[PDB]
Design an enzyme around this catalytic site. Sequence first.
Site, mmCIF file in Angstrom:
data_model
loop_
_atom_site.group_PDB
_atom_site.id
_atom_site.type_symbol
_atom_site.label_atom_id
_atom_site.label_comp_id
_atom_site.label_asym_id
_atom_site.label_seq_id
_atom_site.Cartn_x
_atom_site.Cartn_y
_atom_site.Cartn_z
ATOM 1 N N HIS A 63 -2.947 -4.751 1.885
ATOM 2 C CA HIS A 63 -4.469 -4.864 2.005
ATOM 3 C C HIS A 63 -5.342 -3.970 1.511
ATOM 4 O O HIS A 63 -5.132 -3.183 0.503
ATOM 5 C CB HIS A 63 -4.571 -4.426 2.984
ATOM 6 N N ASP A 64 -6.956 -5.182 1.539
ATOM 7 C CA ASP A 64 -7.455 -4.989 0.707
ATOM 8 C C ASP A 64 -8.107 -5.378 -0.447
ATOM 9 O O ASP A 64 -8.797 -4.666 -1.373
ATOM 10 C CB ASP A 64 -8.719 -4.185 1.412
ATOM 11 N N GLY A 73 -2.194 -0.979 -1.666
ATOM 12 C CA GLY A 73 -3.556 -1.003 -0.831
ATOM 13 C C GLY A 73 -5.094 -1.182 -1.953
ATOM 14 O O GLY A 73 -4.929 0.289 -2.253
HETATM 15 N N1 VFN Z 1 1.911 2.932 7.462
HETATM 16 C C1 VFN Z 1 1.892 3.228 6.900
HETATM 17 C C2 VFN Z 1 2.309 3.788 5.187
HETATM 18 C C3 VFN Z 1 2.304 5.086 5.374
HETATM 19 C C4 VFN Z 1 2.825 6.369 3.880
HETATM 20 C C5 VFN Z 1 2.791 5.151 3.362
HETATM 21 C C6 VFN Z 1 3.007 6.050 1.610
HETATM 22 N N2 VFN Z 1 2.068 5.306 0.397
HETATM 23 C C7 VFN Z 1 0.571 5.998 0.576
HETATM 24 C C8 VFN Z 1 0.180 4.819 1.406
HETATM 25 N N3 VFN Z 1 -0.352 5.255 2.533
HETATM 26 N N4 VFN Z 1 -0.718 4.011 2.834
HETATM 27 C C9 VFN Z 1 -0.857 3.187 2.116
HETATM 28 N N5 VFN Z 1 -0.893 1.881 2.156
HETATM 29 O O1 VFN Z 1 -0.268 3.733 0.904
HETATM 30 C C10 VFN Z 1 3.260 4.606 -0.125
HETATM 31 O O2 VFN Z 1 4.173 4.769 0.081
HETATM 32 C C11 VFN Z 1 2.054 4.311 -1.394
HETATM 33 S S1 VFN Z 1 3.324 3.778 -2.926
HETATM 34 C C12 VFN Z 1 3.031 1.687 -1.214
HETATM 35 C C13 VFN Z 1 2.139 1.340 -0.259
HETATM 36 C C14 VFN Z 1 2.891 0.479 0.180
HETATM 37 C C15 VFN Z 1 3.363 -1.006 -0.496
HETATM 38 C C16 VFN Z 1 3.647 -0.654 -1.707
HETATM 39 C C17 VFN Z 1 3.959 0.509 -1.895
HETATM 40 CL CL1 VFN Z 1 4.778 0.704 -3.868
HETATM 41 C C18 VFN Z 1 2.643 4.271 3.421
HETATM 42 C C19 VFN Z 1 2.308 3.259 4.044
#
Ligand code: VFN
Lengths: 253, 254, 258
Positions: free
Chosen positions: C121-122, C139
Amino acid sequence: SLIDPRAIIDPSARLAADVQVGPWSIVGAEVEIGEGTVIGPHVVLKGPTKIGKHNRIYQFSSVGEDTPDGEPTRLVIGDHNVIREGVTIHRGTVQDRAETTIGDHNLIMAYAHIGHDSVIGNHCILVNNTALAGHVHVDDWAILSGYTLVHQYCRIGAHSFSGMGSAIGKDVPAYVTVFGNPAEARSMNFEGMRRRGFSSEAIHALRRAYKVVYRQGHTVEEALAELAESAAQFPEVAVFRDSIQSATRGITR
Amino acid sequence: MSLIDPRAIIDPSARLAADVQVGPWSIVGAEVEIGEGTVIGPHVVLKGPTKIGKHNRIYQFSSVGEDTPDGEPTRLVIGDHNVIREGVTIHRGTVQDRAETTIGDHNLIMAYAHIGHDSVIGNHCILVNNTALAGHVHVDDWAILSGYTLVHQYCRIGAHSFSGMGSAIGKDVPAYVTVFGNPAEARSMNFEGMRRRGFSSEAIHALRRAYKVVYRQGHTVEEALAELAESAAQFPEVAVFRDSIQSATRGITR
Amino acid sequence: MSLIDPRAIIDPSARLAADVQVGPWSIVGAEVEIGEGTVIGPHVVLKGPTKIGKHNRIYQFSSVGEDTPDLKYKGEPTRLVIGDHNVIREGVTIHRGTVQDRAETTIGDHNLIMAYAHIGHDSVIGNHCILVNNTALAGHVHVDDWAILSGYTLVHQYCRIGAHSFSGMGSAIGKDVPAYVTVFGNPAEARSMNFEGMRRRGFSSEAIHALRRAYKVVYRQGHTVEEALAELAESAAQFPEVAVFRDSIQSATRGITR
Ligand SMILES: N#Cc1ccc(CN(Cc2nnc(N)o2)C(=O)CSc2ccccc2Cl)cc1
Ligand SMILES: N#Cc1ccc(CN(Cc2nnc(N)o2)C(=O)CSc2ccccc2Cl)cc1
Ligand SMILES: N#Cc1ccc(CN(Cc2nnc(N)o2)C(=O)CSc2ccccc2Cl)cc1
Ligand SMILES: [Cl-]
Ligand SMILES: [Cl-]
Ligand SMILES: [Cl-]
Ligand SMILES: [Cl-]
Ligand SMILES: [Cl-]
Ligand SMILES: [Cl-]
């Protein structure tokens, strides 16, 4: 029509009346789907599998497959789970629990892999391409960041956290934050403790606990004995002490 | 009921042995040949010119025989008794190289693995989930690439070698050698594999000595190859190890 | 040989240019707009509000325009905008924006997004970028023009990938990558600059020389980011390419990859 006419529903599959199945989806033999579950298009479901209530399974997922590694094997999924696109979930094996278990309110993101005999609790987040090799136990509220790879027989503790691209070869105690390839312990998931409304006394007792185990030169046996007083006082320090106590492959450091 | 599902798309030029199974919503493209006892699952995309042998199994959401994203005909040849799990991507060759991506027999290619153009996989290999071969990669017999192993273009993976999970291989992996990390580093030899293969104690012992000669005695690759010459004539397994270091064009993983 | 395969599902709210090709068992969901010369392969899922421009190619098993699963998103009228002459290979996932940011995921022109790559996203992708197999943008990631992210590059949220920069395979990027910089490993470390790419683009030897000098000022002379930016000021005024490099260090909010 809740079941799209282009879907394939095996005659032995058992469905609750309001189950939705998208076009070109396969609900294979011995698949059981509960009330309010939505199966997207292009989904492959194979059994013996039980899918509970209000689940959401996205396209290109292969759920309930035989591990590539007549033995009666099973996959059990609870309620309110979200399984995103291309997720692979294998059933258990006779040479263990015969079951892969997924509890409630989990978020399993795109291309994540759940190997045979893995046990996921509740409110877990497995981010894109997280891979559990097999026999992995993931306790409640654990977050595994994108592309976290988990070695067989590893236990991921309650509220623990792994950074992106982590390669976990040892047990991750409850609340511990881990990073890198190979994974290394860095701190406690304090942000996680704040989201859950933990007390300042509990957050401080958990910060104290990390130092006894990792920052005070104590051996696993030395740290476990020193933690006994704090674990008796705080139920969350007891969650931390128990994850170290039950570690078989050693703890991540 | 029907071996070829009525919902599958089979090009008129495709050649399928009488007992081949094709699952629903699969595409078997022009110039795709499929041998006896092969099972094509549902939602599979097969593009040609491609020859698939006997008793293979191809799982849903796989794209096999596609052109490279990176005109003379370019082939993809797949042997017998292979297992290609879900979402696997296999590209055909490029006329500028060999014009062929080759896979031998009894290979297990696990979910979302990628086989880049002009790659050659021998027999009895295991490519664990998300293993990616960038292109022009040679994987010799019995190699095991653990989950998410990334292999740089033109790298050679020796017979009976092993990569740990999440390895990023930029150099050649000699036969039998175990490699780990990003960037990949040589650790030991897969003695476990040798014993499963029925190698003699003497062969295992000579390979252990061969490893020390190459990695732990401060020899140059030239000095190491001359010191291995004797043991290599005595044991075909040591000649396999010695030949993989000799054939290294990107240097060996250290 | 109908351009829209009869086995494909076209939502009545979707807006398509008359020559759009849609393969069998593909879904062109509600509020999806597809431009002239675009080819949608078989087994593709398109969700909206999404604009897909001209002469794009979207391969099988891709899910383009889905909602982010991220717990912060709540069914908002957020967008995905894809420009022209892009290639989206098999199994790619592209998510729409969120109201908490600018409610848009944007991809420009002439991009190559390789198999199973993820665009969170974004995220904003410019032009002529290459996202190799399984690259994942968590994101709010901005990828400027001509960047090359090698196989399995992982990019932390809010990171900025500079113009003509390069990441090695398996890189885990947690900070900003300045323009032209080459980064490797987990965690990503700066190594040099993509001089090879600079030569392919036709940069003068004077520009390449001044960029090599600019790298040393930032990374090899023990200067702070403030000191480095003041020292690069005049070279940036004479060389647009040095200005591109200087601007990427200026706009760095997560610090630069060292
Ligand atoms: N619901 C939620 C939720 C919670 C913690 C996390 C942990 N986190 C950090 C983060 N927080 N929001 C986002 N989009 O990422 C990551 O895993 C980053 S890596 C990554 C992230 C997304 C896709 C591919 C990869 Cl490689 C991620 C999502
Ligand atoms: N047939 C087989 C076979 C042989 C060796 C291996 C090598 N191996 C250890 C192991 N042995 N059995 C299992 N399930 O895993 C890994 O690749 C671990 S990582 C991993 C594992 C599985 C999925 C995703 C990931 Cl990331 C794996 C499978
Ligand atoms: N069009 C193009 C283009 C340009 C640069 C790159 C950068 N690059 C090197 C390279 N150049 N050609 C090839 N096939 O690879 C990698 O990303 C290697 S890793 C990898 C590569 C492919 C698949 C899986 C993985 Cl893991 C890759 C492709
Ligand atoms: Cl409208
Ligand atoms: Cl347009
Ligand atoms: Cl969260
Ligand atoms: Cl690709
Ligand atoms: Cl690289
Ligand atoms: Cl050059």
